[PDB]
Amino acid sequence: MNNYIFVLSSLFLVGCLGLALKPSPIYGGLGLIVSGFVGCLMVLGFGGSFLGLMVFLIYLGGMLVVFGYTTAMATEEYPETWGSNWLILGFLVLGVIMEVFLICVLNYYDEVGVINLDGLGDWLMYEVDDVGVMLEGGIGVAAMYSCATWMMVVAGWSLFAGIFIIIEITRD
Amino acid sequence: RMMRWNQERRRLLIEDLEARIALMPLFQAEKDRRTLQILRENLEEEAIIMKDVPNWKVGESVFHTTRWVPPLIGEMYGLRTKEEMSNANFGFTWYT
Amino acid sequence: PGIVELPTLEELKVEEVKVSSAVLKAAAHHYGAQCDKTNKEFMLCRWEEKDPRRCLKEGKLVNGCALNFFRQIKSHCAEPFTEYWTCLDYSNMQLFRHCRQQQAKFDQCVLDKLGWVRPDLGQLSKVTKVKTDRPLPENPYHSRARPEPNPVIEGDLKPAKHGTRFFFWTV
Amino acid sequence: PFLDIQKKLGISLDRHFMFLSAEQPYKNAARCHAFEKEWIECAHGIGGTRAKKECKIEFDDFEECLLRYKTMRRMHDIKKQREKLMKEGKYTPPPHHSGREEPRP
Amino acid sequence: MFFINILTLLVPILIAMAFLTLVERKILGYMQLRKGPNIVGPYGILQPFADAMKLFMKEPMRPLTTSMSLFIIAPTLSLTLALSLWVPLPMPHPLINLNLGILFILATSSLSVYSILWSGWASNSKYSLFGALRAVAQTISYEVTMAIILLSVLLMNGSYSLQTLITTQEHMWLLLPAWPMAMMWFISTLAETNRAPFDLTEGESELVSGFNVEYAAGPFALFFMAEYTNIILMNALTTIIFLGPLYYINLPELYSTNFMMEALLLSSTFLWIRASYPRFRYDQLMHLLWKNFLPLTLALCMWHISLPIFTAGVPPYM
Amino acid sequence: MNPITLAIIYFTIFLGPVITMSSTNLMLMWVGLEFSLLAIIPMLINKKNPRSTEAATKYFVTQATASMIILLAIVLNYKQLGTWMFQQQTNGLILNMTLMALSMKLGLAPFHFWLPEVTQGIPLHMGLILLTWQKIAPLSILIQIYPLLNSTIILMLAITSIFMGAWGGLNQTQMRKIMAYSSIAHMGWMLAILPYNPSLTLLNLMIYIILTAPMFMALMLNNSMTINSISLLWNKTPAMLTMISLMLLSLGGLPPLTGFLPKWIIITELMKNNCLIMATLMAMMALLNLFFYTRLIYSTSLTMFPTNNNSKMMTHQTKTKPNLMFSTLAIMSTMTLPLAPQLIT
Amino acid sequence: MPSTFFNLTMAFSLSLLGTLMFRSHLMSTLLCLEGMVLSLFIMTSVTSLNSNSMSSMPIPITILVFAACEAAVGLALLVKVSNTYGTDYVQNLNLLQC
Amino acid sequence: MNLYTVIFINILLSLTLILVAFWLPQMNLYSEKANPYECGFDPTSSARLPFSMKFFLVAITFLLFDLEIALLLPLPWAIQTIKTSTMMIMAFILVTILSLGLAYEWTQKGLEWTE
Amino acid sequence: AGRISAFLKNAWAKEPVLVVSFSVWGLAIIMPMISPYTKYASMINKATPYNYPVPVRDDGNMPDVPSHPQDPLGPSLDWLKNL
Numbered sequence A: 001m002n003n004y005i006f007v008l009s010s011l012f013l014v015g016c017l018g019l020a021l022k023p024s025p026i027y028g029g030l031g032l033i034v035s036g037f038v039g040c041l042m043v044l045g046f047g048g049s050f051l052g053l054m055v056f057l058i059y060l061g062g063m064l065v066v067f068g069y070t071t072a073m074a075t076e077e078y079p080e081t082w083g084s085n086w087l088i089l090g091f092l093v094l095g096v097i098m099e100v101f102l103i104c105v106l107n108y109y110d111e112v113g114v115i116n117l118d119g120l121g122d123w124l125m126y127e128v129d130d131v132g133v134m135l136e137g138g139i140g141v142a143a144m145y146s147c148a149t150w151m152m153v154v155a156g157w158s159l160f161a162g163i164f165i166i167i168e169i170t171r172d
Numbered sequence B: 001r002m003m004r005w006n007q008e009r010r011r012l013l014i015e016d017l018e019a020r021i022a023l024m025p026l027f028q029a030e031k032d033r034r035t036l037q038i039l040r041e042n043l044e045e046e047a048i049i050m051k052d053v054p055n056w057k058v059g060e061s062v063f064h065t066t067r068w069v070p071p072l073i074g075e076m077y078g079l080r081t082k083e084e085m086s087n088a089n090f091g092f093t094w095y096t
Numbered sequence C: 001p002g003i004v005e006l007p008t009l010e011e012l013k014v015e016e017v018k019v020s021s022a023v024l025k026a027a028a029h030h031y032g033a034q035c036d037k038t039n040k041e042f043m044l045c046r047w048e049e050k051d052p053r054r055c056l057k058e059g060k061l062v063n064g065c066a067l068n069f070f071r072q073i074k075s076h077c078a079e080p081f082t083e084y085w086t087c088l089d090y091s092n093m094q095l096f097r098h099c100r101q102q103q104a105k106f107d108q109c110v111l112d113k114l115g116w117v118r119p120d121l122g123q124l125s126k127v128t129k130v131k132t133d134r135p136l137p138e139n140p141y142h143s144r145a146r147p148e149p150n151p152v153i154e155g156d157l158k159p160a161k162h163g164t165r166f167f168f169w170t171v
Numbered sequence D: 001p002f003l004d005i006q007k008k009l010g011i012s013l014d015r016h017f018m019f020l021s022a023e024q025p026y027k028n029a030a031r032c033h034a035f036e037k038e039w040i041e042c043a044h045g046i047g048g049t050r051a052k053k054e055c056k057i058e059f060d061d062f063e064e065c066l067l068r069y070k071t072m073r074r075m076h077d078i079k080k081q082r083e084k085l086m087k088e089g090k091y092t093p094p095p096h097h098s099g100r101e102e103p104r105p
Numbered sequence E: 001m002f003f004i005n006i007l008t009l010l011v012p013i014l015i016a017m018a019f020l021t022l023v024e025r026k027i028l029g030y031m032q033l034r035k036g037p038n039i040v041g042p043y044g045i046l047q048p049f050a051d052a053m054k055l056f057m058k059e060p061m062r063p064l065t066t067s068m069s070l071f072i073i074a075p076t077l078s079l080t081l082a083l084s085l086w087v088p089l090p091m092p093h094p095l096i097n098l099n100l101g102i103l104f105i106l107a108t109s110s111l112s113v114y115s116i117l118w119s120g121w122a123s124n125s126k127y128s129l130f131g132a133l134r135a136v137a138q139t140i141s142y143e144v145t146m147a148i149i150l151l152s153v154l155l156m157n158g159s160y161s162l163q164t165l166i167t168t169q170e171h172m173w174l175l176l177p178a179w180p181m182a183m184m185w186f187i188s189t190l191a192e193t194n195r196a197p198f199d200l201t202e203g204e205s206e207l208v209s210g211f212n213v214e215y216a217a218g219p220f221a222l223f224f225m226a227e228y229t230n231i232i233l234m235n236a237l238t239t240i241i242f243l244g245p246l247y248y249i250n251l252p253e254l255y256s257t258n259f260m261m262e263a264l265l266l267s268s269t270f271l272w273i274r275a276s277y278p279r280f281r282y283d284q285l286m287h288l289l290w291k292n293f294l295p296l297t298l299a300l301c302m303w304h305i306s307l308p309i310f311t312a313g314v315p316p317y318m
Numbered sequence F: 001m002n003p004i005t006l007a008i009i010y011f012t013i014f015l016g017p018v019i020t021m022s023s024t025n026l027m028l029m030w031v032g033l034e035f036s037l038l039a040i041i042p043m044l045i046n047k048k049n050p051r052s053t054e055a056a057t058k059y060f061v062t063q064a065t066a067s068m069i070i071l072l073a074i075v076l077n078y079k080q081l082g083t084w085m086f087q088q089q090t091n092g093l094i095l096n097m098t099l100m101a102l103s104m105k106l107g108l109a110p111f112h113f114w115l116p117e118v119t120q121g122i123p124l125h126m127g128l129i130l131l132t133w134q135k136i137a138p139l140s141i142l143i144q145i146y147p148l149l150n151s152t153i154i155l156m157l158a159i160t161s162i163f164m165g166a167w168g169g170l171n172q173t174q175m176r177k178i179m180a181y182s183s184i185a186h187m188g189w190m191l192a193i194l195p196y197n198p199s200l201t202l203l204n205l206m207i208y209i210i211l212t213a214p215m216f217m218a219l220m221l222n223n224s225m226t227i228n229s230i231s232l233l234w235n236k237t238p239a240m241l242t243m244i245s246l247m248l249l250s251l252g253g254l255p256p257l258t259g260f261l262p263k264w265i266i267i268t269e270l271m272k273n274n275c276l277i278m279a280t281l282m283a284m285m286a287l288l289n290l291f292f293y294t295r296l297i298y299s300t301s302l303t304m305f306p307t308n309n310n311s312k313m314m315t316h317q318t319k320t321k322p323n324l325m326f327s328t329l330a331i332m333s334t335m336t337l338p339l340a341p342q343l344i345t
Numbered sequence G: 001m002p003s004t005f006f007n008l009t010m011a012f013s014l015s016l017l018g019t020l021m022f023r024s025h026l027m028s029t030l031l032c033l034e035g036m037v038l039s040l041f042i043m044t045s046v047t048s049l050n051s052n053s054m055s056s057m058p059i060p061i062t063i064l065v066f067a068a069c070e071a072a073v074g075l076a077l078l079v080k081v082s083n084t085y086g087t088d089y090v091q092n093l094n095l096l097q098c
Numbered sequence H: 001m002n003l004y005t006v007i008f009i010n011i012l013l014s015l016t017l018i019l020v021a022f023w024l025p026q027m028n029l030y031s032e033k034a035n036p037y038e039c040g041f042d043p044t045s046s047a048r049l050p051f052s053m054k055f056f057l058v059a060i061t062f063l064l065f066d067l068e069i070a071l072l073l074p075l076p077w078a079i080q081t082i083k084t085s086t087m088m089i090m091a092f093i094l095v096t097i098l099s100l101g102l103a104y105e106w107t108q109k110g111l112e113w114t115e
Numbered sequence I: 001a002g003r004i005s006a007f008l009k010n011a012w013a014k015e016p017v018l019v020v021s022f023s024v025w026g027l028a029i030i031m032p033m034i035s036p037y038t039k040y041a042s043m044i045n046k047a048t049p050y051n052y053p054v055p056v057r058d059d060g061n062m063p064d065v066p067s068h069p070q071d072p073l074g075p076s077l078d079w080l081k082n083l
């Protein structure tokens, strides 16, 4: 129960490896949905739940529109999942073996202390205010409404200009 | 009705937070004393029994500032049990 | 660097309250109004001197006044306070709104005996200006020498000598 | 280049959240507020090469607070020596460190 | 004791959805001047069990042109998301108490949409592809509308929790303060559950069976269980959010009874809607939402931003 | 088009670099870069031909990848120090990734391959807007971190950009590709002088901008796309020829044109910092740049290529040339060498 | 935390390698871009939560907004590419070399 | 830990149900049974050809509006602020520009399913 | 105006959703500017005590701040009590 975040980070690494290995975009969206859920779990484990749930919802909508588009235009008669080429599977397991090799090397080389096998799960949350109200994530995202109105207005203008941009691109 | 009831709930929240404020110094004193007790027992257990390596200082800090640096969760529960460390890391988060 | 100093178990020993959170919250308002001087002295020393190792006497005084307050509560009238804090202990949030009747009986107890008045809606949540004789720490954060700034040049702004002095440009 | 319309007009669009020790939402801190405060107060007015030279003590303390490499190495050394002594049978942990302790509030 | 609590949450929900199938067939029959099943059970009460046994004793019939991994993953995903969505509901005390309960609900609903999409694409058939694309359009429209509705209603509430909704509706419902949001939320729950009028994903008339047209018995039963569990859940969420049951600290049994009565009424309302209305076109559903509900809910979201500010009725944080 | 979306898109094109150069937070610099990219894409794909679509796609994926690397550098700096600016003690790996990604944003070699591709297949005014306005925000970020840059990587990128730009402009016959390779060479000069003097790269940027604004304006006047199209300019607009030749010579760096001034002062500063090898190699490849400019001058001004019959109708009709923009910039980009101490700052 | 941050940095590196190495699919390239975006979001969120930088907590939301804007623009460009050719192939869009 | 156990129990329940569904009945598999359905005839295409959806602009607008949703969602904590005037103005501006974008797209016929 | 009234009545008959949305938008703009309770929301959020009130030293030169919570000095919340 100490290495839970490390297991999640390894799963995120595997999902990003599959996305890099580039299946058919159906399975690419699947891998990105899995990676988004895993990253949500990592953020929730590290702290406030609002950021993880936000990135989960956002990537759910994004990969849904992506699924629609890869059905519409980015498709082929035989969409390769991962086993159309044995090189893709061999490279996936090669990357997994390289990941295990590098983390074993960095555990053996414990001078810097980036990854430690004995010290894993000991330095996840550093210092927390034990007694205290209104210290969770989402209060800062609310402070975007009052303390970073410049961040709020550049995000809003980005979305507004983006509406105009996409209409003019797909005007045809 | 929502205006009146939300104002009443604001008054109730102020009452609860004032009860918390009145209980704050006792919790602060007990928390500081417990933290110092854990640090002292860690320092003694590192001091007498743990370290006989010739090049080692027992109570050596890692800062030159010579003032109080509050301890980390992994610093104060590092010598404790793994279940206690996991409770200190993921107690509030997993309690749902 | 240096060896960090921290007190021993003998000077960290104190008579702990051993009192649950629900009974603490039931007695919170009268505890906060009875000895607010001791609690504010502890908070003032704690926020002035950031070191917890130099406020242990104030913390023991906070524990002592809390113990005296609870001993007065236990001595004078105990069963309406008991039923009040158990009604608070029943709920999942210890909401004061559930058991105002037992709160009224406990307030009647502490008003008839010991003459205590429960604070109003916005009284416990303001600054206090506590008087103390402990000297003000002149160097919090253990700051270093703060090295002096650059020696700013003062004088009249004369024109540049012989113009720009850029190759063959005379002016 | 770097225009300074924020300093010229006196506004602060993005200047109050440049670093950790700067205007937390309700009243909170950022776990190295004192160290970052000391480092910035050291480096102000002498900035650049002089701040890199003669604020190295404050910067090293702040970097140690933020990254905790030396605390990790010290704790790893203590735990490694403890495990070596457990293997050699020369150490028995106390009750409070391993198992039942007396809980204080 | 916690596993016993999980059982007492999960098993009654599954029996409730099976008898929801029975109640749907009987209510539709009695609105169609006929009866429901009354032969299999004493009053038809064994009909869902007979249907379940027949579906689980028919062969699943894996097809040739089919991505088998997604074809198997999708119905199990749908059922586990339906039960996971049932987890955090308070009646009046939830099994799992979440601070961001509504956000959890939204995330799980979107993942259920992904289950439908993956089933439709994996069952490599044209009607399945049609059903998947219709699901994409439908979830676009109701997702944006539902997010705005929940934002405004929980702005009238305090945090994103649901016990806070109970304490908010302790004195009066939320239907009277925000009834247009309740109407648009009811329509959005219909769209989320893929129910009539705008089902459009299992469209029996436009398509053959939509995304289930290649799913034989077994995983088809899993999809049906997930759909009807989601029906009961959306009605339960609507009555928790808007039609607040009576809550007393001394006894919660009357809260559970009131919640049961209102959830049964809204489920019967869903069956009533199915009996009453014909189907939309799936472009007409998008036009209807994006041209009627979205501007009105944007305006009402602005109104519910302004309302606690100018009435000073800002809800507490806790 | 539509005036409302024209105003929105052009205001966002303006707003991107302004936010980047006026914001002290690296995150706000990144959102300014994002503003510039996303705003300029619909202006690129506007004619809706396959070449415009390809150019927009290439530009989008290149700038998106570079901005993602920039954001990686910003997040790693925030992890290391907790601030939102590279102050003094950041990691050299972070700084080198920042430099590499901003080089791919700018388009200098060996990240230069997309720039002639994108500039080709795009209308001339959009090529002008790209090659001038899009290169200020990454240069502003590079000027902001004026120390703490790797001079080795800077000089390698500078020398390879000048070499590849000279060779590419030597090969090309398309005018837009010629302008893109000129951009690559001048960006190489600016990047070369960047870690030693921000004033000199600002000066070279200003000289380059005021030099290639009227070049693009003169291309825009007759919609001249190729060397032959600019060659039949004596029949179309014979008054253009002297200013065209003088601006091409100034882009070549010939004295006494004011385009000699940025190369001269950059060589001076590099002499002051003892980089004679780099300065000499840069000057020789600048001579190569001047060669392909001089071939262009031979085509358009000093000889008279054959013309066709319909240019008689072109002479019959009347034209329109922008006041206060072409002639002013041409004069200031040709005959402003004796104001060199005023130009340097 | 340092092990998790190393894993997130390696995940970003893998998604960058996916972006740089094309396999016949502009949609897959956009997917790799959004994988890089997700890795950066998780890195920023974990850093802010670890350092208790609640004032800097709007930064992940800002990068998510601008990332979805760029994903929107990329999807629009992919639509135009598909309308031009009908296959969405990065090797098929190559005619600007001359 | 509790929520994790409930999630795993639901997943194991769904897996148990589909494993029962696959190992319980009798299997008789042949080619005409497992062929794709296509209403009682052989399919002309492979059901993997491009589909050419007609609401692509609405989908991209949905992406942008979903991120506007993500911006609007911290309002329940935003209304607890001490200023509340800049908060109210900022919320009004955000909702107004979102509505202006929707109105502009409606006027320019963006959400009209161009065939 | 006759044309404006006829246009509004036709819009209310034919498209009574845009009319309601624009009216609600205008009402949400106008109502905070005319309500007498607008300052009360900010004052309530100010008076809500999420943090400990840190005491100050007694130099004897400030008579405005109280010496104890049971004092007439300080920001009393009788406006919220009677609100």
Ligand SMILES: CCCCCCCCCCCCCCCCCC(=O)OC[C@H](COP(=O)([O-])OCC[N+](C)(C)C)OC(=O)CCCCCCCCCCCCCCCCC
Residues within 6 Å of the ligand: E180, E182, E183, E184, E186, E187, E197, E238, E242, E273, E277, E288, E291, E292, E293, E296, I015, I017, I020, I023, I024
């Ligand atoms: C959960 C609680 C219960 C909820 C209700 C449940 C029971 C009733 C169920 C009825 C059947 C529903 C089945 C599905 C029906 C689908 C069709 C449908 O509903 O379409 C939506 C229809 C659409 O109608 P339409 O599509 O025919 O409209 C024509 C539009 N054109 C021409 C462009 C196509 O109606 C709406 O969109 C209205 C939504 C609700 C509006 C509520 C407004 C309330 C008043 C606001 C304030 C007014 C005053 C202004 C200010 C004054 C200040 C002083």
Ligand SMILES: CCCCCCCCCCCCCCCCCC(=O)OC[C@H](COP(=O)(O)OCCN)OC(=O)CCCCCCCCCCCCCCCCC
Residues within 6 Å of the ligand: A041, A044, A045, A049, B092, B093, B094, B095, B096, E073, E076, E077, E080, E081, E084, E097, E098, E099, E100, E104, E107, E108, E111, H001, H003, H004, H007, H008, H011
């Ligand atoms: C068929 C395959 C299916 C795969 C997909 C499974 C989907 C599951 C259901 C949908 C989940 C959506 C995302 C939900 C995340 C959790 C929501 C949440 O808010 O969690 C936080 C919560 C505690 O937070 P809070 O409420 O703030 O409490 C603090 C004080 N009470 O609680 C926590 O902190 C608990 C954290 C863990 C909760 C999730 C556990 C998931 C376990 C992995 C499932 C998948 C495993 C892989 C596949 C297995 C084989 C098929």
